[PDB]
Design a binder for these strands. Structure first.
Lengths: 61, 136, 386, 64
RNA sequence: GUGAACAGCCUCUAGUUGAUAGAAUAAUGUAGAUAAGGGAAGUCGGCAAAAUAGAUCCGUAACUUCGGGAUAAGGAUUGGC
RNA sequence: GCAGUCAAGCGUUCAUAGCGACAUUGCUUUUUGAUUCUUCGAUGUCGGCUCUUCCUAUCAUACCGAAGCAGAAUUCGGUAAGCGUUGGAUUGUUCACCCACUAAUAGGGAACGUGAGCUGGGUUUAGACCGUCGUGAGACAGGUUAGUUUUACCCUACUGAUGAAUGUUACCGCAAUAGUAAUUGAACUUAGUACGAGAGGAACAGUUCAUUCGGAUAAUUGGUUUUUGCGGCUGUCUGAUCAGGCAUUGCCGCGAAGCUACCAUCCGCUGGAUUAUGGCUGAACGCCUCUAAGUCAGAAUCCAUGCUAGAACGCGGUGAUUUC
């Protein structure tokens, strides 16, 4: 969902010309990314070896 | 410009287009001649032809002595009142807007140019700089 | 129908794509034709400008009306540190024109141009060329065959030079490079000329002398994404109009249903690599020595540096070389100085031309005075005690 | 040299600096900067202007 | 308060700080300006803009239905103590 | 509208120097006709302003030929579209017709170029008047005045500007291709001379400047002002003073920096190949001939040196290439 936004400089670390800083939508992703940590650690796993094999966003009504 | 050029001019800063009310400055009787063209100028669309110092313009009369009226006169600008530079790098400018009625070979109709005279119409029109007054 | 009133075309067509250039430095297209009976000397020079000053002269134009009688004239002054040459690179003949088959550096390369190849200096451990200095550690066992591979080959050999920023008030600390054609002769000592001038500088009178026609190649200053009235120069459409006041009016007809390359619309203005040719030189003056702004009969010991210095550049105590008119590009740039292409005929070169009054007046104001020791004893004693 | 001392404040005129105003009564008026000329369009007499040397000389400041 | 004035402009009592915000000034814009030397030469056409403009004194033509035109046109003065 | 064929004759004499009777063969789609093939669930259908290119059926420039051309002026033609072709009065005007200057003031086409570019003066609305016609409503390609000109943020085109991939990263270059620009005039001079026994009156090479266009630059001058820099002035408000607010930037005068002006200054290169045309050598044709092979000079023409961009899939030389 690129079109008609401005170029930046910080995006070329990932090999793209244009980027953003979606400061609100990030803030609900931390609210899960300690919650998923809050029960993966509290299952019996370690906490220094996790990674996200499946992230998913699909649109609501 | 042309008809009587015993030499040539440098470029002076041209600042009198068609429509200039230049005040006549001799004893030709009519004080106020109104410019209609110049002589020796090019052409591009919507550009007014502009009069220089010292050039021979063609310029009708407007008021005055009722014998040289309702015709077209050949004329010559004597002082300009636009800040030209000259080659010494000084910026002269007069106050008056002068002009003398002349006939085409280039020695004018009246008998006494009054007031000051721009000094670079000396060599261009030598037959009227002899009948000048205070020059420079 | 036709266009009802014929007029010339606004803007030159052989200068587009009017685009911002490669770097601050502009490349040079060509060099003079070599003639191998001449002494070996380099043909174009690298320097910085400071800002233009004013000059009166004494015209030797027999025939005109200001013969032997005064004028003013606009000189500019470009200045130069003693630039210093750090290696040659030979180009051989081929059906693709020129081709680099060599490179040979010095042994002690300077830190000002070990600066240049890096783009993030201080984090680096500075380790450029430190395996290439191993080759000179012998008698010449990797270079004497290499220079034999540029004596025998490489029908055109051009040598590269680099400035002295450390002797110049331009706070950049990062020098520059180029090439320069060598238009002397005897190709295999045209090589060995540069073999001598490793780790040594070269002057500014080494390439130019007085009263000759230099040729300027430089870059232009820039003004950003400019519109269409300043860009090309087209007419302002009248006050009555709607959707603008200073656009271009109509672009094309119906057919061709695609707008031309020849039509004048907005974009980039400035910071192109322009040129300007046939500029006259006046005074290749030495900076360190006696009274570089003292002309023939002013007899007043001063500099060419105006009162309070040049604006945005500072003072010149280095070498300087002054140029009639206006070289393209504003202050603090790398303007280069090509030599001629043809020996002139128009009696505008092929004379001697003198000099009568250089200036010192404060170009950071409407200045009045010529020496800080001259406004002192003119005004008297100020509230500042003498 | 080609020095000139002007007609409003005794300032200095060098070739490559300054203007000149003639009048219809044939009187030259050499100035240096437009400060010394825009006062003259407004008709400012130089003997009541606090920086001119024409005013400076007339009150015993730097002559003896 | 200035002023002739409930005009314009600043303050007192009373109310509000409500108009999505941060950063840097590119083009083209909308609103507001200024500009040498000519002065309608632009244009369907002085449209738009500019210029005088308050007050006091002197003056003020044809024409007229004698009431008017008329602030006709024109020129001078203007602070503070 | 434009171009040829003939040639009765004009042109003292002579058909073609320059024209061309009575005819006759075409070209063009800038005139205006003829037809109605496509658009009537809509191509915004007069003129002007601005802007680019194209065509020549050359008005000027460059070089050349022919003149009942002694010189200037001129009349035809040839290659030539590279570069120029204007300022005003009157009208809604394309057209028209004059006043001027210069080199000339050429004709034309690009949906009768161009309204998501503009103004709306005209006509194709509704208001109103007059003249004629009509009994009347009303009509008149007759006249006269006022009358809302809508959207782009889509794709493409173009003008600019980024960028993955190419062992990395950095520097230095190379040039396929594309664009390319300078144009004309006056005086001094040659010279009152060649020509003409007279009136008149040139040319080339030099100059020295100018006209039109383009690229830059801000030394000096001018325009700019929120640097709100300094000073002045008004009304008000901080008890008075010093210092300040508020007056859409209160107003004024000067104003450095910065940007800019044929409103200032500077700069705008020279070699190769050619066309017309003139020749040499030279047949065909024992001569004769610029041609049939060869061959020279030759235009503002073409291509190169120059001037700009550097193919983001065209490439070359060089440095360093993680002891964690």
């Amino acid at each position: 969902f690129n079109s008609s936004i401005g170029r930046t400089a910080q995006g070329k670390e990932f090999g793209v010309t244009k980027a953003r800083w979606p400061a609100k939508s990030v803030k609900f992703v931390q609210g899960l990314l300690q919650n998923a940590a809050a029960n993966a650690e509290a299952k019996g796993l370690d906490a220094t070896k996790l990674y996200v094999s499946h992230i998913q966003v699909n649109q609501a009504p | 410009s042309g008809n009587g050029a015993q030499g040539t001019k440098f470029r002076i800063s041209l600042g009198l287009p068609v429509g200039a009310i230049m005040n006549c400055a001799d004893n030709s009787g009519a004080r106020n001649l109104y410019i209609i063209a110049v002589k020796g100028s090019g052409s591009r669309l919507n550009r007014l032809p502009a009069a220089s110092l010292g050039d021979m313009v063609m310029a009708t009369v407007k008021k005055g002595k009722p014998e040289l009226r309702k015709k077209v006169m050949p004329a010559i600008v004597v002082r300009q009142a636009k800040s030209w530079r000259r080659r010494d790098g000084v910026f002269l400018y007069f106050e008056d807007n002068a002009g003398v009625i002349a006939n085409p070979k280039g020695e004018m109709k009246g008998s006494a140019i009054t007031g000051p005279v721009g000094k670079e119409c000396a060599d261009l029109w030598p037959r009227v700089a002899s009948n000048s007054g205070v020059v420079v | 129908s036709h266009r009802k009133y014929e007029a010339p075309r606004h803007g030159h067509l052989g200068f587009l794509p009017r685009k911002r250039a490669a770097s601050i430095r502009a490349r040079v297209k060509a060099f003079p034709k070599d003639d191998r009976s001449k002494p070996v000397a380099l043909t174009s020079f690298l320097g910085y400008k400071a800002g233009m000053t004013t000059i009166v002269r004494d015209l030797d134009r027999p025939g005109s009306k200001f013969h032997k009688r005064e004028v003013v004239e606009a000189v500019t002054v470009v200045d130069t540190p003693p630039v210093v040459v750090v290696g040659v690179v030979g180009y051989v003949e081929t059906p693709r024109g020129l081709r680099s088959l060599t490179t040979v550096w010095a042994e002690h390369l300077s830190d000002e141009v070990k600066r240049r190849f890096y783009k993030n200096w201080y984090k680096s451990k500075k380790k450029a060329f430190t395996k290439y200095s191993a080759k000179y550690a012998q008698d010449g066992a990797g270079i004497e065959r290499e220079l034999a591979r540029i004596k025998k080959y490489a029908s055109v050999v051009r040598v590269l030079v680099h400035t002295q920023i450390r002797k110049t008030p331009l706070a950049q600390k990062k020098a520059h490079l180029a090439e320069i054609q060598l238009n002397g002769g005897s190709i295999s000592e045209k090589v060995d000329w540069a073999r001598e001038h490793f780790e040594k500088t070269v002057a500014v009178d080494s390439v130019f002398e007085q009263n000759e026609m230099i040729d300027a190649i430089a870059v232009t200053k820039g003004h950003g994404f400019e519109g269409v009235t300043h860009r090309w120069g087209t007419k302002k459409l009248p006050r009555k109009t709607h959707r603008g006041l200073r656009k271009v009016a109509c672009i094309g007809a119906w057919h061709p249903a695609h707008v031309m390359w020849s039509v004048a619309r907005a974009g980039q203005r400035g910071y192109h690599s322009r040129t300007s040719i046939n500029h006259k030189i006046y005074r290749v003056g030495k900076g360190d020595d006696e009274a570089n702004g003292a002309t023939s009969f002013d007899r007043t010991k001063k500099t060419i540096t105006p009162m309070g210095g040049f604006v945005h550049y500072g003072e010149i105590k280095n070498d300087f070389i002054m140029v009639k008119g206006c070289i393209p590009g504003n202050r603090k740039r790398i303007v280069t100085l090509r030599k001629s292409l043809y020996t002139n005929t128009s009696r505008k070169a092929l004379e001697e031309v003198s000099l009568k009054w250089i200036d010192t007046a404060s170009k950071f104001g409407k200045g009045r005075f010529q020496t800080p020791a001259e406004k002192h004893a003119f005004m008297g004693t100020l509230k500042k005690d003498l | 040299m080609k020095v000139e001392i002007d007609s409003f404040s005794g300032a200095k005129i060098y070739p490559g600096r300054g203007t000149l105003f003639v009048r219809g009564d044939s009187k030259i008026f050499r100035f240096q900067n437009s400060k010394s000329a825009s006062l003259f369009k407004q008709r400012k007499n130089p003997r009541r202007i606090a920086w001119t040397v024409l005013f400076r000389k007339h009150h015993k400041k730097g002559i003896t």
